[PDB]
Coordinates of C-alpha atoms and ligand atoms in Angstrom, one line a residue:
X1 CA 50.9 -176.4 -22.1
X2 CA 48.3 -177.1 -19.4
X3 CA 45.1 -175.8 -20.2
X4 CA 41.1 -176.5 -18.5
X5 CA 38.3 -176.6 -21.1
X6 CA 37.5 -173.7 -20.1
X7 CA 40.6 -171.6 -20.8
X8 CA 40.6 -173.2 -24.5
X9 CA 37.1 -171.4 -24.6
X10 CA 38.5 -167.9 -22.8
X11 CA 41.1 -167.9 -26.1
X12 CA 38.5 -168.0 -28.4
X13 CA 36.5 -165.2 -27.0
X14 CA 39.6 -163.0 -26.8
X15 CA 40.4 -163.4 -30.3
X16 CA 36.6 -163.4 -31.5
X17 CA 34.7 -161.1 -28.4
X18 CA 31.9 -160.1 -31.1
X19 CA 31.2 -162.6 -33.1
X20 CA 27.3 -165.0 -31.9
X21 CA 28.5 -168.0 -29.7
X22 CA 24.7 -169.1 -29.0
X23 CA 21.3 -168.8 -30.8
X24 CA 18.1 -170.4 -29.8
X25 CA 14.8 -169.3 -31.1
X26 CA 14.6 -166.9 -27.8
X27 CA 17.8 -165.0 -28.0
X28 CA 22.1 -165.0 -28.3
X29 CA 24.6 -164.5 -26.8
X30 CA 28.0 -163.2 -28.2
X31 CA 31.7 -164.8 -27.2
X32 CA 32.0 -161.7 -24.9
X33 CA 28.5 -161.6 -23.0
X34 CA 29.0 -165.5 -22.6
X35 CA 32.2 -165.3 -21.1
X36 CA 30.9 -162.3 -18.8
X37 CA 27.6 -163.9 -17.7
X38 CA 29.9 -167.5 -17.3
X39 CA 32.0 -165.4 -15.0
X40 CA 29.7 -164.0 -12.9
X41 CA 28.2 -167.1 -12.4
X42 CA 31.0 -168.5 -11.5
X43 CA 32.8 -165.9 -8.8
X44 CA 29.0 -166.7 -7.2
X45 CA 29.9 -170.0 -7.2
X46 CA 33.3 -170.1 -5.4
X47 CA 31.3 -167.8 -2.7
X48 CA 29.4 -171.0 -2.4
X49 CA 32.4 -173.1 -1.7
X50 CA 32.4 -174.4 -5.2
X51 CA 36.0 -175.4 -5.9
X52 CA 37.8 -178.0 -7.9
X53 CA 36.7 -181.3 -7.4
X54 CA 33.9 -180.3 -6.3
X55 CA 30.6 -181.5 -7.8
X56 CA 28.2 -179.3 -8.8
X57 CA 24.6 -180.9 -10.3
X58 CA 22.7 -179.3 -13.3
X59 CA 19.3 -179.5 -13.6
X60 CA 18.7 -177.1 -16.8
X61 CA 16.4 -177.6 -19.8
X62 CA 18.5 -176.5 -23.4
X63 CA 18.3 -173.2 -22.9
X64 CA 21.3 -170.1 -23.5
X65 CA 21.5 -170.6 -19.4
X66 CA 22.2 -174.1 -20.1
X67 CA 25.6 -173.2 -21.7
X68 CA 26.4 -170.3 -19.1
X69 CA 25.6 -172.6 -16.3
X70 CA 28.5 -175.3 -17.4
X71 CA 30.9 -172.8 -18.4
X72 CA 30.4 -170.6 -14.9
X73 CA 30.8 -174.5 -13.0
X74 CA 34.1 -174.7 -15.5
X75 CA 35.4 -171.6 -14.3
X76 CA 34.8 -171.9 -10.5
X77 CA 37.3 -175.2 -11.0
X78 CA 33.9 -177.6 -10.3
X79 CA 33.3 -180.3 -12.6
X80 CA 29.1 -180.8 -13.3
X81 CA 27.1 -183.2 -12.7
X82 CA 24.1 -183.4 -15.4
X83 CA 20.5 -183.9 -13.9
X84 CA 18.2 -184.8 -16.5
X85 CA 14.8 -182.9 -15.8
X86 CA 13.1 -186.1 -17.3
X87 CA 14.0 -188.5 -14.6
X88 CA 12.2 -189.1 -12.2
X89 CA 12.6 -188.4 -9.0
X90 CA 14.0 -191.1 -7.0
X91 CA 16.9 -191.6 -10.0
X92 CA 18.0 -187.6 -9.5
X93 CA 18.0 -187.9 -5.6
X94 CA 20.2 -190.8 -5.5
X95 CA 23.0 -189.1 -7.7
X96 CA 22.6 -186.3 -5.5
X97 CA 23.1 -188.2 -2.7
X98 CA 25.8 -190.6 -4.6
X99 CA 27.6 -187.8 -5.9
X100 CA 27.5 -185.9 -2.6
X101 CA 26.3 -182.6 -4.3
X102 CA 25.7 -179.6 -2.0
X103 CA 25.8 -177.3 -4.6
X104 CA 22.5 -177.1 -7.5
X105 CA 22.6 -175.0 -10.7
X106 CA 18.8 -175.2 -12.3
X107 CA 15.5 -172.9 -12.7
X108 CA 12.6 -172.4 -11.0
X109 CA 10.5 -174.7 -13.0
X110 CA 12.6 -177.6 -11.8
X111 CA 11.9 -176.9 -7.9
X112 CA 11.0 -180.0 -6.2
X113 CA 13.2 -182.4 -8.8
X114 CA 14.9 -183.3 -5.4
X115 CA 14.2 -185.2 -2.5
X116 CA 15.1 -183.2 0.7
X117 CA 18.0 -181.4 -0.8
X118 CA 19.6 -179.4 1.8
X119 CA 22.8 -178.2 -0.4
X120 CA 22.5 -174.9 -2.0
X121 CA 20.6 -173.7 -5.3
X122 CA 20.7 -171.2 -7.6
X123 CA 18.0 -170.5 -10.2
X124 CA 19.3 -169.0 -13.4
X125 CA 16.0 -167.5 -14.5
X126 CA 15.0 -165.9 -11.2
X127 CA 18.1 -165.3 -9.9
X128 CA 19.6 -162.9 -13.0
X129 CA 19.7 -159.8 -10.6
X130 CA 21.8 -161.0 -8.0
X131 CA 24.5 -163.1 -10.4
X132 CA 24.5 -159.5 -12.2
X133 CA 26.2 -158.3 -9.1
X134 CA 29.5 -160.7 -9.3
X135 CA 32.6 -159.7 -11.4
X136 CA 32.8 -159.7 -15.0
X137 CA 36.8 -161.0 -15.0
X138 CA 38.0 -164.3 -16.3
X139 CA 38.9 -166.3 -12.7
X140 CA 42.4 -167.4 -12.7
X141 CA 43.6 -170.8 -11.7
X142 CA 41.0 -172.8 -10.1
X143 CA 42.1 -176.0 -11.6
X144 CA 44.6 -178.1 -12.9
X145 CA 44.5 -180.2 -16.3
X146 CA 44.0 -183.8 -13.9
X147 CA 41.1 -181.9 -11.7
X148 CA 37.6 -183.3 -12.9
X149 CA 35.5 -181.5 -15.7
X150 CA 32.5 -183.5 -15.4
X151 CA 30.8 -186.9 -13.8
X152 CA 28.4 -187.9 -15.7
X153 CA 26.2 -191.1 -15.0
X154 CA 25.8 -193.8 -16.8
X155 CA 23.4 -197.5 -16.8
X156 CA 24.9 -199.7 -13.8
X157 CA 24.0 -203.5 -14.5
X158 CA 24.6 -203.9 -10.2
X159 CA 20.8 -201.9 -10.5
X160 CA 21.8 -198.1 -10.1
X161 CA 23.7 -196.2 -12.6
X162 CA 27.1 -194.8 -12.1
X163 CA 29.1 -191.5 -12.4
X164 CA 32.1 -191.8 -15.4
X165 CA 34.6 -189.2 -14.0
X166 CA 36.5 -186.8 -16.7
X167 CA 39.1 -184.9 -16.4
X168 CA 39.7 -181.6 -18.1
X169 CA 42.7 -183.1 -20.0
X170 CA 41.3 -186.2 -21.9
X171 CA 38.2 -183.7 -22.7
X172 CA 40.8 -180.5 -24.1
X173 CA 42.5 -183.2 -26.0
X174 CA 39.1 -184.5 -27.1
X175 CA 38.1 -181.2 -28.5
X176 CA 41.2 -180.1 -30.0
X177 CA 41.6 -183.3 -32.0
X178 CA 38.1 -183.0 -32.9
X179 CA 38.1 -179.3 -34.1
X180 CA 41.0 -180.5 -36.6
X181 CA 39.3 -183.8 -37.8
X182 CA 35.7 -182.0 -38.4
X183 CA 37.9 -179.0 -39.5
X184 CA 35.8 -176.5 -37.5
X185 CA 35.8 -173.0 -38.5
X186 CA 34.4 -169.7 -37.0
X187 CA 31.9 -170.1 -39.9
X188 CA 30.3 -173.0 -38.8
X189 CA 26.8 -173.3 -37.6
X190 CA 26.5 -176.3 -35.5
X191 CA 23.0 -177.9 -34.0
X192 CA 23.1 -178.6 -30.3
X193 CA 20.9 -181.9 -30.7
X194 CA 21.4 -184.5 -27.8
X195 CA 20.6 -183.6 -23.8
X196 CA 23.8 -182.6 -21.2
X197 CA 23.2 -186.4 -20.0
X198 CA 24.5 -187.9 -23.1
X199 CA 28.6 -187.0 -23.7
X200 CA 28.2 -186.3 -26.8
X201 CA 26.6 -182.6 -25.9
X202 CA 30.3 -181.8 -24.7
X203 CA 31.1 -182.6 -28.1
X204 CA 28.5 -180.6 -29.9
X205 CA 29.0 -177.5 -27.1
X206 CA 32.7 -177.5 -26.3
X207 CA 34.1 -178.4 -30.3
X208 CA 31.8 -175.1 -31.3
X209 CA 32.7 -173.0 -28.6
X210 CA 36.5 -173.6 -28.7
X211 CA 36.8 -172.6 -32.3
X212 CA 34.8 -169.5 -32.7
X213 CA 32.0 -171.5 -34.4
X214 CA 28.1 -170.9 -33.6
X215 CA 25.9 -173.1 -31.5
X216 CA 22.5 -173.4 -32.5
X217 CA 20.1 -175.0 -29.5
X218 CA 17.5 -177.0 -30.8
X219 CA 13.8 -177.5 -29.7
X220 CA 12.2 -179.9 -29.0
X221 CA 9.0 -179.6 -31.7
X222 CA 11.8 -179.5 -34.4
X223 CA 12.9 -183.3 -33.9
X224 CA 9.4 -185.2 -33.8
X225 CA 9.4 -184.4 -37.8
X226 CA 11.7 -184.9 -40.0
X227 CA 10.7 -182.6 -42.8
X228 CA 10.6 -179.9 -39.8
X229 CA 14.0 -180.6 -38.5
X230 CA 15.2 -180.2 -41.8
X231 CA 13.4 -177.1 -42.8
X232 CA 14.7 -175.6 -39.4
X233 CA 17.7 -176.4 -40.4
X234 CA 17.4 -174.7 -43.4
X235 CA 16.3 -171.5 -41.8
X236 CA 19.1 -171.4 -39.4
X237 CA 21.5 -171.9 -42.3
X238 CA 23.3 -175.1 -39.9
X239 CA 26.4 -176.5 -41.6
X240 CA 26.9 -179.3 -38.9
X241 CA 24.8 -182.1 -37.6
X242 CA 25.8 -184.0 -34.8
X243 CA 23.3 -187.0 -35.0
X244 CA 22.3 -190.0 -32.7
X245 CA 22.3 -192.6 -35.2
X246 CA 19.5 -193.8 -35.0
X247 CA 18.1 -190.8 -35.8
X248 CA 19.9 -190.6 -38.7
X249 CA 18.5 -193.8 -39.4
X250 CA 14.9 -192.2 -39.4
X251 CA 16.1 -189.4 -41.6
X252 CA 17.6 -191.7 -44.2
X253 CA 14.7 -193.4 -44.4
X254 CA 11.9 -190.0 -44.4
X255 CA 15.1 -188.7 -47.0
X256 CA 14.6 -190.8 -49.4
X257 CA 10.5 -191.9 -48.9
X258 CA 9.5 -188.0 -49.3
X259 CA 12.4 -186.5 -51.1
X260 CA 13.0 -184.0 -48.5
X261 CA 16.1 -181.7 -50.4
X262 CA 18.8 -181.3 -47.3
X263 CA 19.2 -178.0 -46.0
X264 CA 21.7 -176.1 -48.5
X265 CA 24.4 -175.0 -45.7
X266 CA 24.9 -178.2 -44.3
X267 CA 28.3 -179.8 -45.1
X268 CA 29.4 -182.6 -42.5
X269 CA 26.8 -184.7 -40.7
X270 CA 28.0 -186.7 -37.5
X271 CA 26.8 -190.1 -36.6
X272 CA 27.1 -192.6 -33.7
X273 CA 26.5 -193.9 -30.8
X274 CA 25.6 -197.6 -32.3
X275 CA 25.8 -199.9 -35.0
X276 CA 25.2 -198.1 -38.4
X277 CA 23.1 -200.1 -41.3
X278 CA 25.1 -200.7 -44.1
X279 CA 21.8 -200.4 -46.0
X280 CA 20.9 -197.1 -45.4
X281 CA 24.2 -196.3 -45.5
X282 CA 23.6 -197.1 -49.5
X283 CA 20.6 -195.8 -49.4
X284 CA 22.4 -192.5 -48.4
X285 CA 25.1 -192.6 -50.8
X286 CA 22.2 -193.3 -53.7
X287 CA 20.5 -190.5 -52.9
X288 CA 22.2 -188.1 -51.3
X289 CA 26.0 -188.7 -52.6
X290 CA 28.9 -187.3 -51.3
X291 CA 28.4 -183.9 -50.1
X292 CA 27.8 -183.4 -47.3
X293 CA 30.5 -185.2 -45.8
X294 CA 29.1 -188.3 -43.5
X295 CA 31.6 -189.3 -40.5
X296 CA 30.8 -192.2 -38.1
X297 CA 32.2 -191.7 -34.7
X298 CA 33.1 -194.3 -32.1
X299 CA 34.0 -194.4 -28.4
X300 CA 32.3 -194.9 -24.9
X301 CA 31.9 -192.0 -22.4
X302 CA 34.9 -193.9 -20.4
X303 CA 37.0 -193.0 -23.1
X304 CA 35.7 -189.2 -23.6
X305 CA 33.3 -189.2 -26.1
X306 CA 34.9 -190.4 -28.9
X307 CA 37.9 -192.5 -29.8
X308 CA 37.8 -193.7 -33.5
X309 CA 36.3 -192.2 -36.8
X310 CA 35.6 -193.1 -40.2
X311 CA 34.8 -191.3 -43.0
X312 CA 32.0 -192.7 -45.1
X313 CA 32.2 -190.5 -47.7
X314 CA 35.4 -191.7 -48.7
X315 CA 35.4 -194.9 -48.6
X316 CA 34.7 -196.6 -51.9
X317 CA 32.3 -198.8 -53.3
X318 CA 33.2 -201.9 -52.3
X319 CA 34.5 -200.7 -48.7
X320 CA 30.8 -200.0 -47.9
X321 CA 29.4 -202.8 -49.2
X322 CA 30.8 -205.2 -46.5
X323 CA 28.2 -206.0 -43.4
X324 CA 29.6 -204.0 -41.6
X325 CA 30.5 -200.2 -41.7
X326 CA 34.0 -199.2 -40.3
X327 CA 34.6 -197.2 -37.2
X328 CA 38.1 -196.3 -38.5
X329 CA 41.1 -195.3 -36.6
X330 CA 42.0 -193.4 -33.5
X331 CA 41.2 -189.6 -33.6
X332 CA 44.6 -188.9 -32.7
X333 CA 48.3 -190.2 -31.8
X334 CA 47.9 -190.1 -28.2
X335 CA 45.0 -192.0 -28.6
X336 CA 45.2 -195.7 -28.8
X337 CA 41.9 -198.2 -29.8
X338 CA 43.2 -201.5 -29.6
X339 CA 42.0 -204.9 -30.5
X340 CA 43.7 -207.5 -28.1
X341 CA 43.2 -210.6 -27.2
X342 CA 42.4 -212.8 -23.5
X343 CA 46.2 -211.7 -22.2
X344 CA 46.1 -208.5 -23.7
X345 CA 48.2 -208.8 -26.7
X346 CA 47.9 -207.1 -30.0
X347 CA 46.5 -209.9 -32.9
X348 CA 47.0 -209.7 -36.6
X349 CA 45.2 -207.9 -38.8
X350 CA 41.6 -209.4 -39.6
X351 CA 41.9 -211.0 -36.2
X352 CA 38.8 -210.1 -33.6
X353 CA 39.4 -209.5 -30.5
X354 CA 38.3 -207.1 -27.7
X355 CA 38.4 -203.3 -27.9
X356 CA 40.6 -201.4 -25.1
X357 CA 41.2 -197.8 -25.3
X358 CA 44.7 -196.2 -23.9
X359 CA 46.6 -193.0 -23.6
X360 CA 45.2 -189.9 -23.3
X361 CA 41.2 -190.8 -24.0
X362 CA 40.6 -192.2 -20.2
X363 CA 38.5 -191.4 -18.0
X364 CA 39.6 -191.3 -14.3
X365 CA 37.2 -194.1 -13.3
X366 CA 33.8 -194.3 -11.6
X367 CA 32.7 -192.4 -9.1
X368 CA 32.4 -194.4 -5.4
X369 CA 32.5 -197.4 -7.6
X370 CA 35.9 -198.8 -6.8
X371 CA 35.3 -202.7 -7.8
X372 CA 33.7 -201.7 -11.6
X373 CA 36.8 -199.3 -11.8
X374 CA 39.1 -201.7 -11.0
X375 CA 37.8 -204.4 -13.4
X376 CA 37.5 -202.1 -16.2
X377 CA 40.4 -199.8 -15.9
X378 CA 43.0 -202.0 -16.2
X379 CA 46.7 -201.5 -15.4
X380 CA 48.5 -202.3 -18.6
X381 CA 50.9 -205.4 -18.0
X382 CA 52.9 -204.4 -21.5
X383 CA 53.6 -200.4 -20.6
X384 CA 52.6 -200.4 -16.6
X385 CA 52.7 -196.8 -15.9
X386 CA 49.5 -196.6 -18.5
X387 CA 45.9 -198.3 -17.8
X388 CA 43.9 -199.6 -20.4
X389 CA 40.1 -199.6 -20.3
X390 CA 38.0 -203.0 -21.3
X391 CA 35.1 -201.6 -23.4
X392 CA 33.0 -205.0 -23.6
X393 CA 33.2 -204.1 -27.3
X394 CA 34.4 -206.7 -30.1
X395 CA 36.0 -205.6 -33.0
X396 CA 39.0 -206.4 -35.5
X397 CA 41.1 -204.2 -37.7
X398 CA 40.7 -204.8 -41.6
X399 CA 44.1 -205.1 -43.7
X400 CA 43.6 -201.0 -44.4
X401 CA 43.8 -199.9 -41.0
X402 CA 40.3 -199.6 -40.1
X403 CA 38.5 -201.2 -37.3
X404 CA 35.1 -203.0 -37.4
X405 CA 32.9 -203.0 -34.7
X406 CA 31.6 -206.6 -34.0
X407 CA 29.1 -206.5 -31.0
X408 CA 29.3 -206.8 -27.4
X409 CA 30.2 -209.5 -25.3
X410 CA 27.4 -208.9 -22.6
X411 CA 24.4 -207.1 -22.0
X412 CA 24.9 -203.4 -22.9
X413 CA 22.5 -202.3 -25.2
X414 CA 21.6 -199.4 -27.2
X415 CA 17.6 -198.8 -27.3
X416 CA 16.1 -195.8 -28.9
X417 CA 19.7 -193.8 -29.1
X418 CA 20.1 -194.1 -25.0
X419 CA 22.8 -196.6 -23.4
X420 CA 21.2 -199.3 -21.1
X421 CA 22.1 -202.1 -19.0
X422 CA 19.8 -204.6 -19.3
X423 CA 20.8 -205.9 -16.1
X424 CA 19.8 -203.0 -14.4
X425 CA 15.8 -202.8 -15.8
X426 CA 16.2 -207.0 -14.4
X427 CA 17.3 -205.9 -10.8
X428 CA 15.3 -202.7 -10.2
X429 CA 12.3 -205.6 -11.5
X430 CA 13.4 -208.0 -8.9
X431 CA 12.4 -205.9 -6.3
X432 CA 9.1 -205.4 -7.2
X433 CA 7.0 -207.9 -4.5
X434 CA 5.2 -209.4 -7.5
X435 CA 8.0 -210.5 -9.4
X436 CA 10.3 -214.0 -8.3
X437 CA 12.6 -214.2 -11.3
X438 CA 13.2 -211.8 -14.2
X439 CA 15.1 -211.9 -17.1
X440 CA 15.2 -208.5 -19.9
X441 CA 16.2 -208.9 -23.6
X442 CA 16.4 -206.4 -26.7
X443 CA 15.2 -207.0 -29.3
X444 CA 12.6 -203.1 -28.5
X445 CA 12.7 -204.2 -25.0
X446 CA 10.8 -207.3 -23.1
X447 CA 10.8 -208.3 -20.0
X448 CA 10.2 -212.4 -19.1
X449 CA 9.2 -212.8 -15.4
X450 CA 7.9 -215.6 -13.1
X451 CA 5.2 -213.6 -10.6
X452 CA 4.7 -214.7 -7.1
X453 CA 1.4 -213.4 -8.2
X454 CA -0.1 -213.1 -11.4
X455 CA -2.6 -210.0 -12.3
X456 CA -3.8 -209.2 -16.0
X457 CA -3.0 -205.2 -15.1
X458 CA 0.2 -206.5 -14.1
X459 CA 2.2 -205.0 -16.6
X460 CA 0.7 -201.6 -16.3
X461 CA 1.7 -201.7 -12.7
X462 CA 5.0 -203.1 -13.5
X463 CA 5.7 -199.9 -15.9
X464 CA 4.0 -197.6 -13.8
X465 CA 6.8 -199.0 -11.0
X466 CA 9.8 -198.5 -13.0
X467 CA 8.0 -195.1 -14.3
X468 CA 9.2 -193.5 -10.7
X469 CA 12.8 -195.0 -11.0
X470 CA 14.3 -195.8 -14.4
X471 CA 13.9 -193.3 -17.2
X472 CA 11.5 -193.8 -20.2
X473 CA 13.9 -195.5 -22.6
X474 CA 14.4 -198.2 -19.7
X475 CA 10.8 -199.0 -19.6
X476 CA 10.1 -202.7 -21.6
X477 CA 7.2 -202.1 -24.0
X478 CA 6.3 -205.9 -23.3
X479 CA 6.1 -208.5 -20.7
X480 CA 6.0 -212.3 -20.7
X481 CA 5.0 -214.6 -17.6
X482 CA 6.5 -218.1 -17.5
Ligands
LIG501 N1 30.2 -191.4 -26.3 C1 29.2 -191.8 -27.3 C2 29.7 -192.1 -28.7 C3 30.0 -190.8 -29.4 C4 29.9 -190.9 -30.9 N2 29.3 -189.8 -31.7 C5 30.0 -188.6 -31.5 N3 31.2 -188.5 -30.9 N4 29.5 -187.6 -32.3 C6 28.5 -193.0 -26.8 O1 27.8 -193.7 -27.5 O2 28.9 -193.4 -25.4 P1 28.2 -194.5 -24.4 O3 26.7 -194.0 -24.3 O4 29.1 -194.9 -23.4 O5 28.0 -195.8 -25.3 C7 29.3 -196.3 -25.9 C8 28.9 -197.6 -26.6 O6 28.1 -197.4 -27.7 C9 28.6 -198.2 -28.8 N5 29.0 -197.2 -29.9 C10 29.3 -195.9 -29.7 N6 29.5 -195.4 -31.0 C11 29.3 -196.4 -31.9 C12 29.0 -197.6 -31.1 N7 28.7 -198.8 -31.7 C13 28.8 -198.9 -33.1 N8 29.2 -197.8 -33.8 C14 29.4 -196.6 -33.3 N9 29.7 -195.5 -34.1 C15 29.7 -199.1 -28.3 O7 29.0 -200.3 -27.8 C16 30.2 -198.2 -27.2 O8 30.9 -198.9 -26.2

């Protein structure tokens, strides 16, 4: 049964046309006017030359034209391209360029993002009247299940990041697996939390959407408190929380200090994205107990959002009370997270080894990176018409089937939720004229640098560099001369 994302989505709003798909605080849209402003955004689109393959870039702040923007680039069979607003300049314009995008889906308040852009825009908020003017219909075959869904980029150690390509298979198998794990119904409520550059957004959108649930956009006043995100949440009666975990981290934390009562409709809160602390994780069980459920998800954007889950709430006492918090087990049977060792061999239970993801989770590669896709997606020498791909992750499964997540073998890190090579913050440094040798380290960031020469404003100027090419989150709080 070949299906797009899309299409999974077209079901939903035939058998539930009525029923509120998006709320913000501005406005909603139901299943029916989604799908009808999607389409008429996207029959624009293929009379732009949008077809699939083709890459289309979205510059768009969290908005309800946010969510008709990716499904209208869905429909037209063109796989997106997210352009965060909040990088800078130079960082946007070279995955333009990279990415070869002729086509731009943003607003008005984002002119100028790019650099001589000669390709084509079209401004959702300005631009309403003339979309209006398209058809209405669902467009019929524009892709295929192996065309591309979305690129999105991701840190590149070599000093520029680097587009993970995903087709619309690996991401309908994503979202059907995890509508059945989370057991998403058309009454859930679900918070849209985490920006279109992180893949876990396809996650929060795409699980919602394709099961008749509603997606609630967030702001961003509501995250800067705690005891306002909460209250919000409250008001908007959410029943699911798709949470960076380190934000959860904060939450346990403010949870517990102020006891802040959780919002009464909320039933399943979802976590990852790094290493969870096993002490707020009893900190959480202390306070908060068992409801509502608490599931820790695993998996890199290579292998479409997520690969392996664990549910915390279940686990006993003494299953949470190890050092480490499980990542669990594959989300599904045509999923496979292994733990192999140097030749790529499956080890015993309780040995560790290296993580590789198979089957149906993989990414088609990297985008124009044909060296990094070659080292990390890996023909597999025990089944060779399958690839495996080398996450740089160590784990080992446990004697009851659950895997552990050990650390990484190089140096990937997580810093404020956001994934980052610290290679790349070192090379983008190197070019700076004042700086001979540079080394970055977590743990937040700091940067250690010999100078050609030395200036005690030096590290303002060294942040204000990296200000106009790296985002925010890739910015070292500290510097050290040797
Ligand atoms: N994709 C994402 C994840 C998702 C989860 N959550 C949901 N699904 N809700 C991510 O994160 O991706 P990227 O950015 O690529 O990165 C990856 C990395 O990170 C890490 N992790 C994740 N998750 C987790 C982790 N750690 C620990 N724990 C958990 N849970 C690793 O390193 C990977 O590779």
């Amino acid at each position: 049964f070949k299906q797009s994302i899309h299409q999974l989505f077209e079901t939903q709003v035939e058998r539930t046309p009525e029923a509120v798909a998006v709320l913000s605080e501005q406005g909603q849209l139901t299943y029916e006017e989604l799908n009808t402003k999607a389409n008429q955004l996207a029959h624009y689109l293929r009379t732009l030359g949008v077809k699939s393959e083709t890459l289309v870039g979205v510059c768009v702040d969290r908005s309800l034209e946010m969510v008709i923007g990716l499904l209208a680039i869905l429909k037209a069979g063109g796989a997106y391209v997210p352009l965060d607003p909040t990088y800078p300049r130079e960082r946007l314009t070279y995955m333009v360029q990279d990415a070869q995008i002729s086509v731009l889906v943003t607003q008005t308040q984002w002119s100028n993002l790019i650099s001589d852009y000669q390709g084509q825009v079209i401004c959702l908020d300005s631009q309403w009247a003339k979309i209006a003017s398209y058809s209405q219909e669902n467009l019929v075959n524009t892709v295929n299940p192996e065309n591309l869904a979305y690129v999105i980029y991701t840190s590149g150690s070599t000093g520029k990041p680097k587009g993970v390509m995903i087709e619309h298979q690996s991401l309908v198998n994503f979202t059907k697996l995890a509508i059945a794990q989370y057991q998403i119904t058309t009454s859930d409520r679900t918070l849209q939390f985490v920006s279109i550059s992180f893949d876990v957004a396809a996650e929060e959108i795409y699980v919602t959407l394709c099961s008749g649930a509603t997606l609630i956009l967030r702001t961003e006043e509501m995250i800067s408190s705690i005891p306002s995100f909460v209250q919000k949440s409250q008001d908007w009666q959410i029943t699911v929380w798709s949470l960076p975990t380190a934000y959860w981290h904060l939450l346990v934390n403010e949870l517990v200090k102020s006891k802040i009562a959780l919002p009464d409709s909320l039933r399943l809160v979802i976590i990852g994205g790094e290493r969870v602390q096993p002490e707020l994780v009893r900190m959480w069980f202390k306070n908060v107990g068992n409801f509502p459920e608490l599931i820790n998800v695993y998996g890199p954007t290579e292998g479409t959002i997520a690969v392996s889950l664990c549910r915390l709430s279940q686990l006993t006492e003494s299953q949470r009370n190890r050092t480490e918090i499980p990542i669990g087990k594959s989300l599904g049977e045509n999923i496979s997270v292994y733990v192999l060792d140097e030749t790529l061999k499956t080890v015993p239970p309780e040995t560790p080894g290296e993580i590789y993801i198979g089957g149906t989770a993989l990414a088609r590669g990297y985008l124009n990176r044909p060296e990094l896709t070659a080292q990390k997606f890996i023909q597999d020498p025990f089944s060779p018409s399958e690839r495996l791909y080398k996450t740089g992750d160590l784990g080992r499964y446990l004697a009851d089937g659950n895997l552990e997540y050990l650390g990484r073998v190089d140096h990937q890190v997580k810093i404020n939720g956001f994934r980052v090579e610290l290679g790349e913050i070192e090379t983008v440094l190197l070019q700076h004229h004042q700086v001979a040798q540079a080394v970055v380290i977590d743990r937040r960031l700091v940067a250690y640098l010999v100078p050609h020469s030395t200036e005690e404003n030096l590290t303002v100027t060294l942040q204000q560099f990296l200000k106009n090419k790296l985002p925010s989150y890739m910015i070292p709080a500290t510097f050290v001369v040797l």
